[PDB]
Write a protein that binds this DNA or RNA. Structure first.
Ligand SMILES: [Mg+2]
Ligand SMILES: [Mg+2]
Ligand SMILES: [Mg+2]
Length: 49
RNA sequence: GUUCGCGAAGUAACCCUUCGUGGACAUUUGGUCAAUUUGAAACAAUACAGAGAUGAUCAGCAGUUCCCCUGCAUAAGGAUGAACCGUUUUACAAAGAGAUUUA
């Protein structure tokens, strides 16, 4: 269960944010598998953005 | 048909009856509409499917329309009622550069 971040799913994210915008995360974890709302937005705001 | 009155005849004795005539009484309904095929109900059945916002499953209010339906309704429902989701070129110019033609 313990995961780490491929730049694959990371890129799919930044594309997703680049569409749906930040605060719709529950959709951004739909495209993205393996991952959750709080996980997505956690790494986003704390790192990727 | 009633009544008033006149005349005539008969009965009669100023009437009872019959005939004729004058007068009054009484005075214009209804239709926007013909009687089943060809001057207009709408459902149902067959087939085709089989519920907006989303990646997905639902609550919903609205907004516009030469669409309306149910409801006493200025209530509220009818898939949040349905239709919307499509097609998309000119107030048009200014500066610069090359090719062509001409005074
Ligand atoms: Mg309504
Ligand atoms: Mg619904
Ligand atoms: Mg409506």
């Amino acid at each position: 269960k313990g995961g780490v971040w491929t730049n694959v799913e990371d890129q799919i994210l930044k594309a997703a944010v680049q569409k749906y915008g930040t605060h719709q995360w529950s959709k951004v974890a739909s495209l993205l598998q393996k991952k959750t709302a709080r996980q997505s937005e956690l790494r986003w705001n704390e790192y990727l953005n």
